[PDB]
Amino acid sequence: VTNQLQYLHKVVMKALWKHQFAWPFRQPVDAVKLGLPDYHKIIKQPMDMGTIKRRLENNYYWAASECMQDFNTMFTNCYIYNKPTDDIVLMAQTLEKIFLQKVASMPQ
Amino acid sequence: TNQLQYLHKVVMKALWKHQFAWPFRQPVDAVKLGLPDYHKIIKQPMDMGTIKRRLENNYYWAASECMQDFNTMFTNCYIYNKPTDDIVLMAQTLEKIFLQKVASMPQEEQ
């Protein structure tokens, strides 16, 4: 329960979870539901905010960098998988910018 | 600022010398690299050479602004390239170092 992890939970996740573009990212990508049969062939390490939030809640992370990498993986999966012009990409980009803006003020 | 100094002398220095950094040290040259669709897909090109020059010329007002340019550079790479391209792995490797070093940045900006 480090100062960094508390920041990532109370400031970063708090902001991202409730954001109006967060909804596609709140649970693991469901390739059946979304009709994406190639999703898991392209994306080998799925990640989502629900998984990250639960991990923060359950003291899963040993370091802040580990949580930061999970956020990063989530956004990166989105950019890699989707078409450049898909709305989801803009949504991720917007959430990622908040992530980085907040992480710039995180404890050391 | 103290954070901008850190981003320049600690974060950028370590990223710059990395064995996977060479594609990212200058703007994407779409003509030289034979990528005629690059600028039709990527509307905000960014690279470490541009960021480094901006740090050296005191372009940035806050660390967050510089960090956003790093993010754009990496995001551009993931958006433009095919999932299976080596450059994607190279960017991922560099971006992990970026996040690692950003975590250790002094928290209050001077």
UniProtKB/Swiss-Prot annotation, chain A:
<comment type="similarity">
    <text>Belongs to the BET family.</text>
</comment>
<feature type="binding site">
    <location>
        <position position="81"/>
    </location>
    <ligand>
        <name>a protein</name>
    </ligand>
</feature>
<feature type="domain" description="Bromo 1">
    <location>
        <begin position="1"/>
        <end position="106"/>
    </location>
</feature>
<feature type="binding site">
    <location>
        <position position="82"/>
    </location>
    <ligand>
        <name>a protein</name>
    </ligand>
</feature>
<feature type="binding site">
    <location>
        <position position="83"/>
    </location>
    <ligand>
        <name>a protein</name>
    </ligand>
</feature>
<feature type="binding site">
    <location>
        <position position="87"/>
    </location>
    <ligand>
        <name>a protein</name>
    </ligand>
</feature>
<comment type="function">
    <text>Chromatin reader protein that specifically recognizes and binds histone H4 acetylated at 'Lys-5' and 'Lys-12' (H4K5ac and H4K12ac, respectively), thereby controlling gene expression and remodeling chromatin structures. Recruits transcription factors and coactivators to target gene sites, and activates RNA polymerase II machinery for transcriptional elongation.</text>
</comment>
<feature type="binding site">
    <location>
        <position position="82"/>
    </location>
    <ligand>
        <name>a protein</name>
    </ligand>
</feature>
<feature type="binding site">
    <location>
        <position position="86"/>
    </location>
    <ligand>
        <name>a protein</name>
    </ligand>
</feature>
<feature type="binding site">
    <location>
        <position position="38"/>
    </location>
    <ligand>
        <name>a protein</name>
    </ligand>
</feature>
<comment type="subunit">
    <text>(Microbial infection) Interacts with herpes virus 8 protein LANA1.</text>
</comment>
<comment type="subunit">
    <text>Homodimer. Interacts with E2F1. Interacts with (acetylated) STAT3; promoting STAT3 recruitment to chromatin. Interacts with CTCF; promoting BRD2 recruitment to chromatin.</text>
</comment>
<protein>
    <recommendedName>
        <fullName>Bromodomain-containing protein 2</fullName>
    </recommendedName>
</protein>
